[PDB]
Amino acid sequence: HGKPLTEVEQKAANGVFDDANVQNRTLSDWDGVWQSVYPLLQSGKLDPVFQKKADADKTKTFAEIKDYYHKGYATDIEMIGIEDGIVEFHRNNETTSCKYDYDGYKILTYKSGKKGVRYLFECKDPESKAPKYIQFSDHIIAPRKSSHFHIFMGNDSQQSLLNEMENWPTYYPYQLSSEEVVEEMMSH
């Protein structure tokens, strides 16, 4: 399940790192078949996660937490498959795909002061119907296989996506059982 993170990596994941620490990554870091976690939230299976967080965070109610993740996870792209430079999106019973080109990364500084890195990709295949712009965010700032990721998709501009803060379709390995998904969110 991937090597334990170093102190640096753990800090980075927690939004603490300096620009010089950030490095470029390849689309292969996200290779695999991924499932959207939105269904688990709609089914109530993620409730134990929000229950735990609410008991731990006296300033947040269960509803506030679940609502945060509700806005965050919402999506109709149930599955995402990534292989050999091609990202494919499954919305309902229809698929779109593009051989995305890497456009680099962007380091964002959040209103709370914490930081995070977005890895940008762009679709330049005119026949494609997939999103023109996409961004991966997974609490990682240097080459390493992702364990789960948040993806931003759009057709206007990369800046537009950088402006997004509430919706972020989240994906975990398709092979991962639902019980393991809950464990990972609660255990980290």
Distance CA 38, CA 168 (A): 10
Is 188 annotated in some ligand binding site?
A: yes
User: CA–CA separation, 165 vs 152, rounded Å?
Assistant: 10
C-alpha dist (Å) from residue 97 to 82, 88, 143, 181: 9, 4, 24, 26
Can you tell me the distance from the alpha carbon of 89 to that of 78, in angstroms, rounded to the nearest whole number?
Answer: 8
The token pair that represents 50 in the structure block: 């929000």
Consult the annotation and say whether 148 binds a ligand. Answer: yes
Smallest CA-to-CA distance from 103 within 21, 12, 24 is with 24
The three-state secondary structure class of 26 is coil
Q: What is the token pair recorded at 9?
A: 């990596």
Distance CA 100, CA 141 (A): 20
Q: What angle do CA 75, 81, 87 make, to 5 degrees?
A: 90
* Position 3, amino acid: K
Which parts are annotated binding residues for Zn(2+)? Answer: 139, 148, 150, 184, 188
